[PDB]
Design an enzyme around this catalytic site. Structure first.
Site, PDB file in Angstrom:
ATOM      1  N   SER B 111       0.809  -1.218   0.000  1.00 50.27           N
ATOM      2  CA  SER B 111       0.000   0.000   0.000  1.00 50.27           C
ATOM      3  C   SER B 111       0.841   1.267   0.000  1.00 50.27           C
ATOM      4  CB  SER B 111      -1.008   0.049   1.097  1.00 50.27           C
ATOM      5  OG  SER B 111      -0.365   0.242   2.346  1.00 50.27           O
ATOM      6  N   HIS B 161       2.183   5.065   4.091  1.00 50.20           N
ATOM      7  CA  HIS B 161       1.123   5.828   3.514  1.00 50.20           C
ATOM      8  C   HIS B 161       1.503   7.194   3.016  1.00 50.20           C
ATOM      9  CE1 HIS B 161      -2.692   3.355   4.461  1.00 50.20           C
ATOM     10  NE2 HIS B 161      -1.719   2.630   4.015  1.00 50.20           N
TER      11      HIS B 161
END
Lengths: 4, 179
Positions: B111, B161
């Site tokens: 991610s 992130h």
């Protein structure tokens, strides 16, 4: 545990 | 259409690793693939990247490989395999570095690479429309909902992130200077  | 070999090799790598996690347990694969938790391990160079291949639920790997195949596919198709490789290698290395700092070495998931692709596709498609790439307003909506939800712990790896995003923006900025 951390989720990326 | 969209089917690059890098796109698919990452998808296969992730699925192969996730099959292994299911047979062997998470920790066992984690012990080998996670970021070095001990400086003595620092020359196990695969670990700086391999954390990206580990997924901790089926929903996570599907959701991630979706974004990866969508945004990853687009980068490979329009910009080549080499560009996809580089965004991947840099964002995996840097989001893991930041993530380790934020909260130590036990994390994984693609991610961070994904937020780097989101950053990249969006800024590149903004500053440089002819690249043939763009990120829609609905998806940058959801990306933004997605980061901040990780702040508020409703998306757990926040350094990943924010790291990945930054990396993708920066590289897209650099690439958008050159035309």
């Amino acid at each position: 545990v951390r989720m990326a | 259409e969209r089917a690059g070999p890098v796109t698919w090799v990452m998808m296969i790598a992730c699925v192969v690793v996730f099959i292994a996690m299911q047979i062997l347990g998470d920790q066992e694969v984690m012990l080998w693939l996670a970021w070095p938790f001990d400086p003595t391990l620092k020359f196990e160079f695969w670990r700086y990247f391999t954390h990206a291949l580990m997924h901790f639920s089926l929903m996570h790997i599907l959701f991630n490989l979706l974004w990866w195949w969508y945004l990853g596919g687009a980068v490979e198709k329009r910009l080549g395999s080499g560009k996809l490789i580089v965004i991947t290698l840099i964002s995996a290395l840097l989001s893991g570095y930041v993530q380790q700092k934020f909260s130590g070495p036990w994390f994984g998931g693609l991610s961070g690479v994904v937020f780097a692709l989101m950053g990249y596709v969006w800024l590149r498609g903004e500053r440089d429309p002819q690249s043939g790439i763009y990120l829609q307003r609905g998806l940058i909506i959801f990306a933004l909902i997605w980061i901040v939800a990780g702040w508020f712990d409703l998306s757990m790896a926040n350094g990943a992130h924010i790291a990945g995003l930054a990396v993708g923006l920066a590289m897209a900025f650099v690439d958008s200077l050159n035309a």
